[PDB]
Structures are given as structure tokens and as C-alpha cells.
Amino acid sequence: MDIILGIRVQDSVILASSKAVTRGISVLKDSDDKTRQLSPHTLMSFAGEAGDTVQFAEYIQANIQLYSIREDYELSPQAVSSFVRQELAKSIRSRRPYQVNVLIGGYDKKKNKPELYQIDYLGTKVELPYGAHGYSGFYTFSLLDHHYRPDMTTEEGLDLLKLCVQELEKRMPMDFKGVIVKIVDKDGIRQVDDF
Amino acid sequence: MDIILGIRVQDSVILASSKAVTRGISVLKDSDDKTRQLSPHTLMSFAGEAGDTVQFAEYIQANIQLYSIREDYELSPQAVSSFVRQELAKSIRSRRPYQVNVLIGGYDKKKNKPELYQIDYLGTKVELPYGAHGYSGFYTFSLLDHHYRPDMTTEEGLDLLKLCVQELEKRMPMDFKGVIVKIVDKDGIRQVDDF
Amino acid sequence: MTDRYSFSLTTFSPSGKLGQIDYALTAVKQGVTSLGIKATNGVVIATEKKSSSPLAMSETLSKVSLLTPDIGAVYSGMGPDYRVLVDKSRKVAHTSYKRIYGEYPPTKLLVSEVAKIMQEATQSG
Amino acid sequence: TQQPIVTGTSVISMKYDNGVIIAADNLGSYGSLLRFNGVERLIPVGDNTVVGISGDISDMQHIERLLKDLVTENAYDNPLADAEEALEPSYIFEYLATVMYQRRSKMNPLWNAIIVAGVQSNGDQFLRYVNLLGVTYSSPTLATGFGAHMANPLLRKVVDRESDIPKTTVQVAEEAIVNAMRVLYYRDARSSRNFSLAIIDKNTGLTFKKNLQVENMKWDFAKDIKGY
Amino acid sequence: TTIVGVKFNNGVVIAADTRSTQGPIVADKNCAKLHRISPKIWCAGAGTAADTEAVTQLIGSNIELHSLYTSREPRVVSALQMLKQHLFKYQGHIGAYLIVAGVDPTGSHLFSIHAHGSTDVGYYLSLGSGSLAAMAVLESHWKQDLTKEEAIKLASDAIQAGIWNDLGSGSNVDVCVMEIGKDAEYLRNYLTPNVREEKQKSYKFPRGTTAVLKESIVNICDIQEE
Amino acid sequence: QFNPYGDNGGTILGIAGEDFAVLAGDTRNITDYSINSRYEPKVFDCGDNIVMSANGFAADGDALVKRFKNSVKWYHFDHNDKKLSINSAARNIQHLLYGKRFFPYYVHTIIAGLDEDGKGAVYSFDPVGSYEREQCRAGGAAASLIMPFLDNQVNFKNQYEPGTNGKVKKPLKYLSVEEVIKLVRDSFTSATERHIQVGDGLEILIVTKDGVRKEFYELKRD
Amino acid sequence: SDPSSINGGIVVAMTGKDCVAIACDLRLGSQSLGVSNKFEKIFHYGHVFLGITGLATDVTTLNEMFRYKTNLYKLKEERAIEPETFTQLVSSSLYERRFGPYFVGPVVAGINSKSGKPFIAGFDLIGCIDEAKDFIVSGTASDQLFGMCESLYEPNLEPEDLFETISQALLNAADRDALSGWGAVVYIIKKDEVVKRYLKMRQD
Amino acid sequence: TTTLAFRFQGGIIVAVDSRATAGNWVASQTVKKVIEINPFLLGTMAGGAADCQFWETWLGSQCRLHELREKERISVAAASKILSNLVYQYKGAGLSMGTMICGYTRKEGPTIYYVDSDGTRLKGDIFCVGSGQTFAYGVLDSNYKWDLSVEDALYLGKRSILAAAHRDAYSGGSVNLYHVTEDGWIYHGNHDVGELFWKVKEEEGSFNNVIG
Amino acid sequence: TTIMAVEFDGGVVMGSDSRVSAGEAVVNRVFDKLSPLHERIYCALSGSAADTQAIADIVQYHLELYTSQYGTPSTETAASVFKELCYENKDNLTAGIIVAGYDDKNKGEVYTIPLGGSVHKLPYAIAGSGSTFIYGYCDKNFRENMSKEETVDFIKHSLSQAIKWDGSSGGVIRMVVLTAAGVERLIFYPDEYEQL
Amino acid sequence: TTIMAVEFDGGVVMGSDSRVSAGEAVVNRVFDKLSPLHERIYCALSGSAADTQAIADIVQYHLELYTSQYGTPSTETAASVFKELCYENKDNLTAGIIVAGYDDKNKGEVYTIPLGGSVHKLPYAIAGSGSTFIYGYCDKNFRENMSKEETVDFIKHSLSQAIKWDGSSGGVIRMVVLTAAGVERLIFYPDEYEQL
Ligand SMILES: [Cl-]
Ligand SMILES: [Mg+2]
Ligand SMILES: [Mg+2]
Ligand SMILES: [Mg+2]
Ligand SMILES: [Mg+2]
Question: What positions constitute the catalytic site (chain H)?
């Protein structure tokens, strides 16, 4: 499937997601943003079966936006991840399960801490310093295991992420047409427009 | 192996062949030459099932080099292509057929004409102004059908080939790690070392 | 057992003669006279039915044999050698022609096939 | 979806000048076992219709009950049940044809081939076919299963086109049917010697013949055949 | 395909239709299914057309050689034995279903043979997609001590049943009559009851209707002198 | 396993004239190599100057034609006896066919009549209700044998004017009802010779402003 | 997957008055992909013409095989092979591969040099001979050709009339087949002159 | 089948082929593969002819109900999403559909959404769908600019279908051209591929490989 | 197929029906299933028509060759040649064979060779599709040292029942009587055996 | 399983073996296959033990509820209730049922309901795996208007043969005699019926 990486540094979470959308023979698009803002300080990247990915992401987004209005309050990243896990855990024993894997990068404004949650289509949740889905981990985790330090700056996090993407572009057979990078911190969500 | 292109211009034949060798998950090499010189003025590019491709190419090479020594004479490109077709036509009804597709680019020193032959694993031979194997034709033939002139120069042929490779690098899902380009003319076979 | 005679029994003598072919021609010379005459609208082949005994029924011994509907053969020399050649000639007309082209061979080509069988008995082991 | 268990073979029929004839042997087969020898497969509906059924016998007995129920229902609040508002062959057929197609469309068919033979109010010969798929067709001659292959060719030599129907007498038509039943007994491995024959005439009404046998059989040439 | 063989007083008659089909499509509207093994031994083939034709010519070839070797006219039981032993060896992979009939010094004979190498004897036989249609007519009208005229009539009537009622059969009726002490008479298109009606219109085009790019003389002659 | 579908063979042909339309079909009904009926009508007058044929599986064919005829009857009841236009009939049949998208009517459907300008009209449907107005459409067993002939002899495809050599096409001159019927008869005569499932009889329904007329012609019965 | 419809293409042969015609499209493809528009499917050995449809590798192989055999025939017989004899050779050659056959639909056309009688024949892939008087069809649009030929054909057509009939039969059949077209050639064969005409047709 | 649609300065160009095939057999050469949802919205037909026809006609009904209720032209975004949400409900059932929803509104400008039967909904500038899509992409990619004139853009769309029609066995018959403006789509005719090929070959000097 | 052989005082009697079936179509309704190997040795064939006819031809060849060298073969010898062919080629054959013969030393003998290619010497043997319906009847009506007439009645009644119930069986009942006197062919038509 | 019902002068007699098999293993060698639904209406069960027992229980309940309302049901009525269950659930059932009962107006009656769920009223019926071996014997030996003793001997001899040949059958022969006098249960042990 498509590559979605995540790395939690000192004061922010960084989500990198491929831009390619391939339908069998042809690459239909090379600028696809595989992410949805769930709340001002929570971002979710996704990869899986065509159609199901966006349908699930927008469904979650709608539910978190509904809660935000009802209570006039932003749910903690932990609370949002738990809600998403339950929805995927419910989905696997459904008539037609969502084949969707997600990373949830959020900044908890109460604890003043960045948080990264990795949830697969089964509803398998784990909190990680850095995560991936599909084959992305196989190429990148050896580099992250070596270089990652919990007191890394955002700039150091982006540099380690560039080394991860470079290794993917070298050894992965598929052309994923680069990655859109987004940072989640105390000030909210912004996109790195040059990568 | 993946993409092999051929274009016959006014006074030469140009063969472009991808550098990537992928074994399932990883790209093992990015500098593979998918060609063998059969005789001083005949070059054969190849793509198909792993092992069979090189085994077949080297077998053909040996047989043409043997003929060259025995008769002290270089077979015409037409004669070489007919020999290669018969070997593949023999192979398809064997216990285990050679799963190999080939382009044969040769310069006939008698007729003073460049000649490009396309032969698939079944032994389906055609003489073409430009050819390809697999999915390479699907992306490139619309550009070649448009721009190709029979009075084209070698430099014009290379320019059209660059446009073909650019379209492949845009719309093909697989990263084939660029192409090695070789020219076959009256002076023999040389490699374009910057492409 | 096994046929351990894998070598030629016919060989060139110092004078360049193939003895066994010469001696075979001597056997033909001793044989009863047979002839053939070609007309504009047909061919005739004839021989004498030299009956070995008057008790023998010489109608049961065929010296003139049909090879194909349009080809006939007569001989001079050793009768048994002729009989097996007729059997081989009739079969080769089918195997090496009729079963390929769906028609009987022309005279010259069937003669060519019989000739080839008789040449091989001159060089084979 | 099921598979047929206890089965009946060919039902054969043809039109003649004044009415229709239909026939079917009295056998209920259980694969290659000739298990039941006293099965009636021609079921009369009133005095103007005979429904002949081949295929699954359990589904035949169900259809037999539907028709019995149809006669009862028609008689309810119907002073002309035995006159103008009596069941027509065309009514009985269309009902069965509806049921057959509905059942195939639920993927739960009645595993049968049915021929409805009868004479209409205006004296018009009725003869139409319907099977487990709900496929329907009419013809001067109709036959099911093995009959289609062997009976039709013989019956079509009597009545080939529609124009032959007025030229065909009941004696010629019955003779042809009885000969076809003998040929089917010779050549069908799941046929019996005993059969029923029904004539529906616009003048003489419904004649139902039970316990008919195949006779005048040729076997005497068997003694001559020696070896293979 | 509809093929029948019928025994009569002083010989045997074989008949067949003239339609060869590529599935639903009719390839030849006047095919010849009546093959000659030997001058007075004819057979007719259903199943794989190439196989029936090929297996006849092979046995027909070997029968001719056997006849020359033995100085005797070929027998039907010989053709029979050679056909079944050949077909059995290939375990039905040669899809040749034949009705073999003929006369020889022994008398008149009628056999059938299936692709797997089984054989059948009888006074009347049928074969092919139209065999049931044909066998219905044979079972209705056959009797012991048929005359030549009655047998030809019964045979052709049995083929007609196939032509009309079987989609696999059609067009014309071929017949071959093999009577003892006589030459076998091969009657090709004995019946022609399926002639196409004149079309409503002529489809002959005006000359120059087709667009042409190039023209050239093709050299079919050898290399010339001088 | 139970197979709810079968093949009853048959071939149908619809041609739209300038001020008329014909829908023709052979009267033969078959399963495998057997003939069920030599005359089983396949082309039906559905009222409102519309003729319809649903060729393929005869059960699904009879079911669809029955339901459309029913749709015409209820269109009259619901909309003050308004005449159902051919374009409105076509769209209605799409909804009937697509209604069973996931258990289709195994039929190729053709309807013929006049549009609301009085010009000849033919509509062609796939089993699941995709439809298009066409000048010329054959359906069923021998469709592949007929259409190439109609391309050549109706639309004058690959025909050019003598002397020009490919430069000027043969002009598309309008055909009379007599001219169309000749091409229909020759189509079915040719189809009968080369296709085993085609023969017995040909029934043609001609639609003009005056109403629906029928013509029947014998075909070879082999 | 089906070997007889990978490459595509058609051949048709017809008989006229003292003449025969054989015609073929020029397309070679890899299923949906058009590869060549110059792949001629009609060959000749002396005055006998052979068209071959089906798997292109076998088309080329059988041409090389029949050239081989007819060349040896001529050297031994001291005369060019006739259509009737060549038909039997094709039949023989195909059936000798009964259980591993060439995936081809061959078509023989020519005039007997002695009798002057026009001759055509067709074969299935294992060598069964279809010797029709009227016409022979072969390839991925054989159904379409059967339709065209059955309606367009009438017997005893003069050479220049037969050309128009076989040309229209091929062109309109090819235009109703995805895997046929991309050009067409027609041979008009008389006892001692043969004309070869390339037809202009749509290139889709 | 070959269908494309691309965004430019002048609006949207939509180009399609006309061929329909059942196996090797060419069923139709006169198929409308552009569905006129309403005077301002176009949709392309690829995959299931019935699926595309039926559901994009249905979309035209939903779009009409929207503007009756909201008294405002439906956005291309909203129109595309009604269809993508509908086919997503039928996911697994076996709907086959690959289509581009095209429209030009005030708030959006010229907009194209690729909608697909496994539930995909992509906004984009250039989309190609069908058996001959790869051929069309080649011509599009090498010639496409935003600042194309309406005349040149129409030709590029026509030339791209011709490229596919030539090479792809399952594409051809004729080319249908549409130009989508803010005030609605304009039909730019039916062009026979047979006649177009020879015309383009001569005037352009392309397809030298083919003899004419 | 319905075939059986019975050992009696005089010698042995073999019986059979005459029906050859392809699915539900009777291909031949008067087939002779009693084919001789030697003068007073006969076989009854069940299973694949091709396989059984091919084997029967090979045995007849072996017994003809045997006779030329070693004189008249025993019924045991005939059964042994059958078993050898059936057992060695069990993977490619579907043949169930009953062998019945008459020596002057051994008198009447019956051997059965089922699918496996085993041999069983029995006082009487039943085989073919129809035999399953008459296991009960045959077991309770077979006696040893019956007369010729009694043995004819026993086989006639037995095959009658097996024809009545088995769709794969029918036609005429043929019988071959092997005694010191020689060989006698008998035939019984439906009209006779149906009313038993 | 071997089961059979026979119509005679006095009334009807039902017979059965007593073997229940799971592959080659005899699970129970003394099972009672004759189950009463009413006082003088019994059923013999063949096929799926689960399916047959389940249906028998329901029919018994239906005839009990019938009796409470409408009085004693006819044997025809009992057969009809079975057919309804077997026919309507033919896709999920493997049951072959013989129904034998005694009215005073109808006297002895036998009905068979095979796999399909069809009904056949017969003078006598045979069913189960063992029945195939005694079609010949039963057809030859059955008479109408036999005595009680004759009918017991006919069933004893019939099931004896069917037990002898069928591996799925064996144990004791249980019989139930339905007459005006009432219900009589009979048992016959191997040592008795084997020597017949
Ligand atoms: Cl070429
Ligand atoms: Mg016909
Ligand atoms: Mg085409
Ligand atoms: Mg194309
Ligand atoms: Mg019987």
C-alpha cells in the first residue's frame, strides 16, 4: 500500500504521507494529501483499501467535530485514538470491514506533550515514539532505532525523516512520488511546503 | 526485467533498457545492463523471467560468436534475428520454455541500413521503426507515433527517447532507476554514458 | 547373440571393383530373361514362368507384381530377393508418399526409393 | 436449489383435427433402480384438460395438489363453475407457468417438465409446454426429456406444419403416439412397458385409458446376432 | 452429424448427412462423411472430423498393403480389428466414432466403433448428434429380409429425421450401397431437399467501389533465361 | 447445482426507416441441438404503436415483455390515457432491466416505433438496462453474421464512388420499406444457411403512422 | 490465454470464373496492443497460395516449413506442387502434431496448371480439410466473414468483379472485429498472372 | 474504451471514443460515453455502460432536487460526492464504474472529480480512464499547458483519443468533443476515427509508420 | 448389465441380458455379452466396453497360442490369463469378468474376477449392475447338482428380476450351456420371462 | 439399515434389523428402529439418525394433538404429516420413512416416503441400505392376503438375506404386528434366522 510515517520529537509530532495514487496500471495523481484534521491539535494520516480510507477518515472527522461543538472542548489525543480504535475494532466483525490503517499525531494542551498513536484495520492501538504501516517500517525502523532521541528538535526530526524517505526511494520498487510532511505542536497543525 | 525500448533512425538503432533489478520486496541493483553484443554491429536487449533472460542472451551470443569464427564473417541482422526467433519458437513447446522477450538492434554493413527486430518469448518476430516489450509500449507508442520521422538524426532519436522515458517516469508505478542507452551504427556499438 | 556384423561386407578391391555388386550382377545374368518395351500409349513388361516342377502350380508364383495401381515390376535373378523388395516397394509407396501427399508416387520417385533400399544393402553392416 | 430423487421420464403429446392426445408411462425411477411401477403422471383437471408431468415425483404430487385446490377455489361463489366459468386449459397452464417461473426466480425450482393438453370453450386445441426454468413454447407436437429426441421426429412425420392438423384423424394420431411409446420403451433405459393415454376431443370429451401396454415388439432378430 | 447403416437381403447400405459445423456455425453446407477404407468397405465418421478422416486413411492404407501381401480382397473384420486396436491404444484421445459396412468373400457385414475402442454389431445402426432421431425411424420401419430399394429408402428416411430435427445435422443425404458380387455404388447427394432460395437482390458492386493504395504484378514464374 | 438460466437461441433485427420502423425475428425456439417449436412468436405488439422483442433466455424474455405491456396499461390509467412515446418507453425499460441488476434478465432487448416527430426509431438494450437509439441493430445467435452486412448495405461502409478511388464516399440515400424488407429477408436467409439455431420461419412487424402490420416468410427447416 | 486469438487477424478465399482470390488483414497485436500493420498472412510456393491465421509464431513457422517442403518437392518431382497435392501436404503436416498442434487456421488458394480448374481449401488446427466450391474463411472474425461471404458471393464472378466482392467481405468483417484491420491485401490469381492490391481502410 | 477530461484557462475539455465490444466482437461504434447529467454537468462512461448511464442519470435527478430546495446551482464537489457515497453503499455488490464528473461553477471554477465503483473520489486537473488510457496520457502530458486556447485544447483532447483509438483494439469508432464553460457545456461534434486518422496523418505529418 | 454363471450336474450354464447403455440412451438392445475364448470356455463381460473387449481379444489370442503348443487349456488357466491382464493393469481398466468352462476331468467350473483383479472360484457367480437386486433371491434358490432344466429356470428367474429392477439391464436373456455333448445357445424374449 | 412393512389378511406387519453404524464401527447392535406415533400406527426410520428422530417426535406430537381434537387419525393422515415435514425441508433432511398402521375401516395400510418427500401407498414396502439385495426375493415371494404366520416368515426370510449381504445391517430382527386384537412385539435372534 502507500507509505505513512510518524515521529514524536521533544515538542511536536511529524506525519509524512506519500503523494502517489495508483489505480492498477497508471499513477492517476502525484499530489494526494492522505490526512484529515480531526481537531485543531490532532491530525490523522491513513492508508488502506481505495474509497474505505477517505470514507472512514471523514466519518471520524465529522464525529470529533460534533463532540467539539456539543461540549465546546477539544478531546485529548488519547481520547480521540481510543474512539478511532473502537470504530475499527467494531468494523472487523462487520459484514464488510474497513481495510484502513491510521496514524494519529496530536499535541495534548493539558499535559503539554506530543503523542503518536499507531492503529491498524483490526483496531490494534500502540503509543510509539515513531511508527509506520505496511512495508514502510521494514526500510525505516533500523534508521529510527539508531538515530532517534526523545529530546530531538523539530528540525532534527525532519532531518531523520529525510534520511528515512531517501532509504525508501532507494530500496522500494514502487514510485510513491515523494511525501507531504505536516507538524502538530502547541500552535496547531502546519504543512512543510518544501520537502 | 521491466522496460526495454528500441528506435531505428536514419543511420543507427538506439536501445534503451532499465537499470533496476527487483527481487520481490527490495531493489537489489540500480546499474544492470540488460544487453549482450552478439556481433560487432548487432546488439540484443532482453527482459523476462529471472535467470532465463541472461542464460538465453549468453547462449545466443556464444552461437553467433561461434558462427563468426567458423566462417570469418558477420551474419546480417536479419539472419541473427531469424536464428533467435527459431530458438524461441523451439523453446515455447519445450518441457520448460524460456520466458524471454528481446529487441535486436543491428546495422547491416552490406545494405548500409539500421534494422530493429522485436521478438517475444513465443517467437513472434516483427521488423519495426520503433518497438518495446511488456507495458513500455502502452506509455511510449503514442509519443513515437506522433514525433517519429524515418529521416531522424541520432541526436533527434535520443531527444524523442528522453521524452518517452520522462512519460514512463511520470505514469509508471514502478521505479526502474533510469535507462542505459546504446547506439548501433556503421562504426559499431557505443554506450551514451550521460542520460 | 546381437547382430555383431556392424561392418561392410561389400568393400573396394585394389582395382576399384566392389566384388559383391559384380557377383550380384553375375547372379542376375544366370536368371531367366525378362524385358520391357515402352509404346506411345502404354508400356509392356514380360518374362518366362520357368516352373521348377510340373506338379507345382506356377499361377501361385507371381514374377510380374503390381506396386501401385499405375506401376508394375518384373525381375531377373533371385526370386526370394525380388519378393521382399516388392513388399518393401509397396510399403514405401505409402509411408514416404501416399500418407503425405494423398496420391501414389510418380514412377521415377518410387524407382528412386527401391534404388535407395538396394544401395543401402551395398554399404550397410 | 435441490436435485431430483424419484423421477418420471418422457411425456409425449400431439394435436389432431378435433382435439389433443397425451401419454406418459407409469414408472417412478430412483436413479437406475425402477423403484415404483404404479405411478399416474397424467392428471386430468375437469373434463377439458389433462396435465402431463415428468421429472421429480415429489414436486409432481405438490403440483397435483395445487390443481386439486384450483378446482375447489374456482367453485367458490361461482354458480357457473360447471359451465361458462369452468377452468380452461389456458387458465390452468398460465397459473402453472407463473408458479414455475416464480420458483426458479427464488432459486428453488419445481424440478419438472409439464405439458398442458386440452380443448378450449370455442373448441380450439390447446397444447403448451413449461419446465423448471419457466420456459414456455407451443407446437403441433410436444415431448419432454427423452421424448423430445425420439418421439417428436416420429410425431412430426404425421403433423409437420399447422396445416397438417385438420388432415390428422384421432385413429392416425393415437396410432403414432402408441408407436412412439414402443420406440421409447426400446431405447429409454428409464422407461416402462405400462403407460396411460388421454384423448381430449371437442365432440366426445375426455377419454382416459389406464393400464395400456407396449405390444407387437420385434426381438426375433436377436437369435441371429452372435459375438461382437 | 447423422450416420446410419442398414443390412438388406444381398448386402448392406450406409448413409450420412452433408453438414460440418464449427460449434453453432456451419463450415461446409455439402460435406462428404462417407469415406472409403477399401473399394467394397466404406465407413462414415462422427466426432472429431480430422480424427475420423485420418484413422480411415491409415487403416485404409494398411488394408491395401495387407490385401497385396495376402493376394486376397480385404475383409470388414480386418478393418474392424485394426480400427479398435488403434483407437484403444490412444484411450479415446482420437475422437473417431465410425459406422463400418462392406462386402467381402465371407459375405456382407455392418459394425460400429467408438473412440475408446468398443465395437457394436447389428442389422441397423446410427451415430452422431442426430442418432436418436435416426434410430426412432429405424425402430419404427425396420423388418427382416429388406430389399435393396427398401433399405436405401429406410436409410435416407433415417438421415432426413436427423437433418430436420437435429441442429447438428442438415443439407443433403449421401448413400453408398455395397451388394454381394457387385461393385459398391457411391450415390453422392442422393437427396437434395435444402437448396437456398434466390436472394431478393444482387450484391455485385460497381467496379472502382473499393479504395486501393498500391497495385503490383506478383512474380509466380521461376528465374528467367538470358 | 441449479442453473436458473438457459439459451433458447433465436435472432432478431430492428431497422429504422425515414417515416417507418421494422422489428423482425425468426420463429424457431431451441435448447442445445433440439427444436422446441418451429413457430413460437418472439416479436410482440405492446400497444401505443410500439413493437418489442427480448431475445435470449425465453422465460426472462416473456417475463420482461409481459411487465412492459403491463407498464403501458398502468401509464394509461395513471396519466389520463396519454400515448407512451418510444423515448419514454425506452427509459421505462431501462428501469425494468436495472431493477434486476444483481439477477439480470438474460435477454438482448430491441424496441421499434416512431418518435414524436413521426420519424423511424429503434432502441437497443443490454441485459442490465444500458440503452441507445440506433438506425440498425441485429440481436441474438446470428447478430455477428448480420451486422457487418448491414454496415455495408444500409450505411454503405467501405463503399466509395467509382472513378474517385476512395476520395468520395457513396452518399447515404434513404431506403423505402420494400428495400429494408429485402435486406431483412436476405439477412435471415444468409443467417439460416450458416447458423444452426436460425431457420423455420421469419416474422416481421412493420410500424407506420397507420399502425402495426405483420409479414411472415418460410425459412429452411434443417 | 486462447492461443488462436492473442495476435488476431483474418484470411478469406473465393472462386470466380477461371480465377481465385485470397485476401488478409495486416494486423499483428499482443491482445489489446497493436504491434505491426505490415504482418502479411498470405504466402506462395510457385503458383499455390497459402493464407494462415492464428498464433503469429506458428504462422511464421509453418510458412518456413511449407517453403522447406515444397522446395524439396520441386527438386525431386522436377515440377511445381499443385493446389490439390499441397492441400494434402498441409493436412498431413498438421495432423502429425495431433496432440501438440499449431494454433492456426490455414487457407489454400490456386489454379491447377494442367486442368486450369480454380481450387480453394480450409483446415482446422489439426488438418481436417474443408474443400468448399464457393468460399473459405479463417481468423478472429470468421463469423463476420461467413455472414458477408454468404450474402455477397455469387458463382462465376469475373476477376475484376470478384476483387470488389472479396474486398468488401474482408473490410466490413474486419471493421466488426477489435483484433483485425490495420490494412488489408487482396491477391487476384489467374492461370499465368497474379495481381496484388493493398486496400485503404480505417486504422483503429 | 478511452475517456479523458482536463482543466485549462478556457474551462474543461471532455473527449471520449465510441466503441463497445463483447469479447473480440464489436457490438457498437455509435455509443454515447458522455452522459449529460444536466446543462452544466458532464460525466464519462467507463466499466459498466448500464451502471454509468443509470446512476449518472439518477445524479441529474438528485442535482435538480438540490437546486429546487436550495435555490442555487449544486457545486461539482457536492454532485460528485452524491454519486461516490451512492456507489460506496453498493461496494462488493459488483458495480463497475470509472468516471469523471465535470463542472464549472462561480465558487469552484472549472472542476473535475474522478469517481470509481470501489468508492474513490479524486479532484484533479487531468484524468484518463479505459483500456486506451495510457496512450491518451502520453499525448496529454507532453502537450498540456494551463494557457491553452479553447481551439488548441479541443484539438489536444481529439488527438489524444485518436492516439488510443489507433493502438488500443477496444477503442475507436468516433470521437465526441465537449467544452464545459461556467454558462454550461458546448457540444463540439462527432468525428469518425476512420476519416480523422487520414486527415491528421496528412496535416500533422504523424503516423509515418502507417501507409496512406 | 446382468450376467451369471451356475455349476450343475451336466456341466455349467452362463446367462446375460442384451442391453448396452450410454447414460439413459440404450445404444444396443440385442448385444451378445457371452463371448467364447475356447470351444467350451466362455466369458461374461461387465464394466468399460472398450477395456473388456480389448482384454477378451488378448485372452482368446493367449488360449489359441496355448492350444497350438500344450493342447486344450483348463478353465483355471483361462481365468489365470484374465487375472494377470486385469491385476497388472488395474489402474487403467474397469472390467468385472465371470469365466465359465467345461473340462472332462474338472467338469463345469466358474471363476469371478472383480474390479481389483482378484480370482474367486465359486459354485455360481453374479456380476454387473443388475446383480445387486438378486443376491437375496440367488442365495436362497441356488442348489448344487441341479439338472440342465432346473439351472436354465434358476438363471431365467434370476436375470428376469435383475432386468425388472435395474434400468441398465434389459432386452433378451441369452444363455450358453457347456457340457460333454458340446455347446448349446439359448435365447428368451421379454414376453416369456416378464410373466414369470 | 434394513426395514420393511407388509399388508396381510389380519392387518399389517413391520420388520427391521437392530444395527446403528458409524463408518465401520457398530455404535449400537440392539437399536429399536420401529417407533410408535399412535397406538396402532408405527414408523420405520432410514437415513440421518438426528433428522429421522427429530421428525418422528414432531409427527407423534401432531397425531397426539390431532387425537385430542378430532379423535383417532387415519394411517393416511399420519403418512401425510411425515410427507409435509420431509417435502418442505428436503434440502436439510436425509430421511426415508415407511409408515404402517391399522384402522378398523381401512384395516392394514403401508405408505413409503423416500428421500424426495413423495408418498407411495403400496401392498408392501422395503427401505434402507439392505433393501437393494432383496428386491428380487421380495417381488417373487410376496402374495396378497397372507396369514400372520406366512407374513412373519416372509419378513424373517427377507431381512435375513438383507442382513447376510449388507454390512450396514445386522443384529436381531424386531417385528411389530398391527391387528384388531392390538399390538404384538416379536424378536428373532441370529442363531434362528441365520440357519434359514
Ligand atoms: Cl513485419
Ligand atoms: Mg438452419
Ligand atoms: Mg477493427
Ligand atoms: Mg483500435
Ligand atoms: Mg429394464
Answer: 1
Of the candidates A115, A128, A133, the one whose C-alpha atom is nearest the C-alpha of residue A17 is A133
Give chain A positions within 8 Å (CB) of H84: 51
Q: Under an 8 A CB cutoff, do A29 and H118 touch?
A: no
- Residue H49 annotated as lining a ligand binding site: yes
C-alpha dist (Å) from residue A157 to A15, A127, A130, D72: 11, 18, 10, 88
Number of domains in chain E: 1
Q: Does residue A98 come out as left (phi exceeding 0), alpha (psi in the -120 to 50 range) or beta?
A: beta
- Contacts of residue G146 in chain F, CB cutoff 8 Å? 145, 194
D1-228 CATH fold: Glutamine Phosphoribosylpyrophosphate, subunit 1, domain 1 (3.60.20)
In whole angstroms, give the CA distance from residue A156 to residue A152.
6
CATH of the domain at A195: 3.60.20.10
Burial environment of residue H24 by CB neighbours within 10 A (0 to 12, 13 to 18, 19 or more) = buried
Q: Which residue of F has its CA nearest to D142?
A: F36
In the 8-state DSSP scheme, what is residue G80?
A: P
**Chain B residues with CB-CB distance to G6 below 8 A:** 122
Sign of the torsion formed by the C-alpha atoms of G105, G106, G109 and G114:
negative
Domains of chain H: 1-212 (3.60.20.10)
Distance CA H157, CA F194 (A): 43
Domains and CATH numbers, chain G: 1-204 (3.60.20.10)
| Closest ligand to Cα G8 | 3
Report which DSSP code applies to G156: S
Is G33's Cβ below 8 Å from some Cβ in B? Answer: yes
Domain parsing of chain D, residue ranges: 1-228
**Residue E191's CATH number:** 3.60.20.10
Touching H: which chains, 3+ CB pairs < 8 A?
Answer: A, B, E, F, G
Q: How far is G12 from chain F (nearest CA, A)?
A: 15
Identify residue D56 by its one-letter amino acid code: D
Which of G33, G39, G61 lies at the smallest CB-CB distance from B126? G39
| Cα–Cα distance measured from residue J144 to residue J127, given in angstroms and rounded to the nearest whole number | 20
**Resolution limit in angstroms?**
2.8
**In a 3-state reduction of DSSP, which class is residue B160?**
helix
Q: Does I132 touch chain J (CB under 8 A)?
A: yes
- In order, the DSSP letters of A43-99 are EEEEEESTTHHHHHHHHHHHHHHHHHHHHTSPPPHHHHHHHHHHHHHHHHTSSS---
| CB–CB contact C100 G85 (8 Å) | no
CA distance I163 to chain J (A): 10
- DSSP per residue over E75-122, as a string? PHHHHHHHHHHHHHHTTT-S-EEEEEEEEETTEEEEEEE-TTS-EEE-
| Rounded Cα distance, E129 and E159, in Å | 11
Breaks in chain D listed by the residue before each, with C–N > 2.5 Å: none
* Nearest ligand, measured from the Cα of G180: 3
Chain E with chain G: Cβ pairs closer than 8 A: 92
Q: Look at chain A and report how many structural domains it folds into.
A: 1
CA A112 to chain centre: 20
Q: What residue numbers bound the domain in which A22 lies? A: 1-195
A25/H122 CB distance under 8 A: no
Q: Which residues of I touch E (CB under 8 A)?
A: 20, 25, 27-28, 30-32, 48-50, 53-54, 57, 92
The answer to whether E27 and E70 have CB atoms below 8 angstroms apart is no
- Provide the CATH topology of domain F1-222: Glutamine Phosphoribosylpyrophosphate, subunit 1, domain 1 (3.60.20)
Whether residues G176 and F148 touch (CB distance < 8 A) is answered with: yes
Q: How far apart are CA B148 and CA H205, in angstroms?
A: 9
In sequence order, the 6+-apart residues with CB closer than 8 A to the CB of A71 are none
**Is I100 in a helix, a strand, or coil?**
strand
